[PDB]
């Protein structure tokens, strides 16, 4: 796993972020997420939704994973990408229905609405089965046999979604059984897919006006160093103290995502002859590019093509 270290948000009793629960830095976004958790607990989350604005690799997925963990240890979490709704074997809304149903859990021991639906379908998924389970769970909830635990639906790259998909989200959040919708994006003012209109995050204004927007800023040299040290532990990789300094500087230069991609690779270069050194970090840097170098060389080739 990649978020294997995350066990919550690591905030104290006053929701103040204490490095804790597998979290490193990102204090402003953690306390903000903590406020969302209290707004959920009271019951003021209804009508509203959450959005994590920030650059790629700034902890957006980790914070929502922490948000689900802090809510409960037996609570559903469904991480999906904007592009995942555009599938050959499925519909845009069929992927979104499955994403919502995966997030709503049933206590009897816990089981999501999707597992209950997938079981009865296999005995894609006939719509008649879904309308039945909905009425069935409603009676079970009424009598007191089953308890509904609304989970967390994390949708990253939310700028890929269209007006038809945002319409679905508005209809699904209208349910009482509805989970907490934590969206995320790397985009500013872009056009809303399916329309000729430009908007912040590529989200329509009718949904923006109900959003709890949080911001994630890139990590410092000290923050980046601990994330890579926590990854080395999770990947059982031994590295020299000055290799961390070179890897983090590369992690600041390019990305943390790429720095983590280098951890796995740089250790097998060390396994070719004890502890990963600066030259193993430097060798694997020339061996594997970062997207910013990959596009630069292609631009340099296409520039000389005009000469």
């Amino acid at each position: 796993g990649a978020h294997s270290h995350i066990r919550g948000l690591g905030l104290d009793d006053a929701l103040e972020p204490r490095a804790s629960q597998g979290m490193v830095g990102q204090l402003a976004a953690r306390r903000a997420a903590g406020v969302v958790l209290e707004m959920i607990r009271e019951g003021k989350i209804a009508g509203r939704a959450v959005l994590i604005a920030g650059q790629p690799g700034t902890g957006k997925t980790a914070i929502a994973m922490g948000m689900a963990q802090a809510l409960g240890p037996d609570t559903p979490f469904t991480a999906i990408a904007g592009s995942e709704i555009f599938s050959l074997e499925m519909s845009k809304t069929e992927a979104l229905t499955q994403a919502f149903r995966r997030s709503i859990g049933v206590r009897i021991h816990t089981v999501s609405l999707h597992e209950i639906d997938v079981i009865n379908s296999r005995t894609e998924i006939k719509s008649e089965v879904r309308e039945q389970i909905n009425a069935k769970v409603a009676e079970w909830r009424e009598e007191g046999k089953a308890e509904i635990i609304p989970g967390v639906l994390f949708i990253d790259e939310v700028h890929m979604l269209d007006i038809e998909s945002f319409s679905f989200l508005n209809r699904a959040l209208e349910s009482d059984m509805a989970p907490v919708l934590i969206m995320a994006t790397n985009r500013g003012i872009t056009r809303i897919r399916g329309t000729s209109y430009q908007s912040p995050h590529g989200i329509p204004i009718d949904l923006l006006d109900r959003l709890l927007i949080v911001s994630t800023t890139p990590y410092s040299e000290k923050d980046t160093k601990q994330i890579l040290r926590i990854r080395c532990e999770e990947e059982d990789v031994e590295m020299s103290e000055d290799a961390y300094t070179v890897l983090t500087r590369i992690g600041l230069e390019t990305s943390l995502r790429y720095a983590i991609q280098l951890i796995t690779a740089a250790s097998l270069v060390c396994r070719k002859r004890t502890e990963v050194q600066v030259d193993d970090i430097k060798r694997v840097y020339s061996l594997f590019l970062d997207e910013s170098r990959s596009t630069q060389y292609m631009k340099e080739y296409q520039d000389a093509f005009l000469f």
Binding site: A14, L15, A28, R31, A32, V35, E38, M39, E42, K44, A46, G47, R48, L51, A53, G54, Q55, S91, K92, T93, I163, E164, F166, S167, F168, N170, R171, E174, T185, N186, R187, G188, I189, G194, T195, S196, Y197, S199, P200, H201, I203, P204, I205, D206, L208, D209, L211, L212, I213, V214, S215, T217, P218
Partner: protein, 316 residues
């Protein structure tokens, strides 16, 4: 004794709106019936409630044109509250018609049914009966209710057309507008108010063709336009104070003044939306009301759309 389909969430932020708040001459008082300032728009909304009642709104529609957060949704709810209490109000957004699951004709029809009701006193709407006698709402399931409704009318066991608020009007395609125009022509139909924040706009379902607020000129000709204006920090502070009273949230004038000056830099919606998380952060901090530093914290913890769009763009 039946159920109510009413969208609670959509009208939760407008609970303080009890009517228009206009004196006997027709003129608006600064603060009355839950409404603050917005005198000319409230006064123009008075003439509309008069026009509906005097039966002079044949084929006519309304448009509330102003910046976002300037009480467009509040005034359309005020018109419903002015014609009488329990008079149906339907708050929809233009993008709601674009669904893969349900057809464009089915979305609109439901809203019109939600916007027309009957007093049997049983304060209920046409759509409320639809779900009750389906406990799928088809062409056949609807018609069966129409005949049942007609039977109660003929004898004397009262039809009340309400208000259908269509926000983000520019989002609608040319085919959606025709559906509205034909429906607005009927006598038992409800007054349709539209809301915009744009100027000359390209009508959806077309290309090249630009028209005021993206509305076809066929419809736009039979439209009464009401302007809504940006609130001052002073007008805003009165609204943020009223909302806090309605939610039972205690707050200091110092925090309120800062919350009001945020409304200037953001919208009236954004500031009021901070009233709840700040009240919750005070609960954690063991304080009764919201201090000036609680508002300043929730302003640092949470952002508006434009601010977060700027951060991402400036970082890149």
């Amino acid at each position: 004794e039946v159920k109510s389909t009413t969208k609670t969430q959509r009208i939760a932020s407008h609970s303080h709106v009890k009517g228009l708040g206009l004196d006997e001459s027709g003129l608006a008082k600064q603060a009355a019936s839950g409404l603050v300032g917005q005198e000319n728009a409230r006064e123009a909304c008075g003439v509309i409630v008069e026009l509906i009642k005097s039966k002079k709104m044949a084929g006519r529609a309304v448009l509330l044109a102003g910046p976002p957060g300037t009480g467009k949704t509040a005034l359309a709810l005020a018109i419903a509250q002015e014609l009488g209490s329990k008079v149906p109000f339907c708050p929809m957004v233009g993008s709601e018609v674009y669904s893969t699951e349900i057809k464009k004709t089915e979305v609109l029809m439901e809203n019109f049914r939600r916007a027309i009701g009957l007093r049997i006193i049983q304060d209920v709407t046409l759509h409320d009966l639809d779900v009750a006698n389906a406990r799928e709402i088809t062409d056949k399931l609807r018609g069966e209710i129409n005949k049942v409704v007609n039977k109660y009318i003929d004898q004397g066991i009262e039809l009340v057309p309400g208000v259908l608020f269509v926000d983000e009007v520019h989002m609608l395609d040319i085919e959606c507008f025709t559906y509205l125009h034909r429906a607005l022509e009927s006598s038992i139909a409800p007054i349709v108010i539209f809301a915009s924040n744009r100027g000359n706009c390209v009508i959806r379902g077309t290309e090249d063709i630009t028209s005021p607020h993206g509305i076809p000129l066929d419809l736009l000709d039979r439209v009464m336009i009401i302007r809504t204006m940006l609130y001052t920090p002073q007008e805003m502070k009165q609204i943020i104070k009223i909302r806090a009273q309605t939610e039972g949230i205690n707050i200091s004038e110092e925090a309120l003044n800062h919350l009001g000056e945020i409304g200037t830099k953001t919208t009236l919606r954004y500031s009021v939306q901070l009233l709840t998380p700040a009240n919750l952060l005070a609960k954690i901090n063991g304080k009764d009301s919201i201090e000036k530093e609680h508002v300043e914290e929730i302003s640092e913890l949470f952002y508006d759309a434009k601010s977060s769009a700027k951060i991402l763009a400036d970082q890149q």
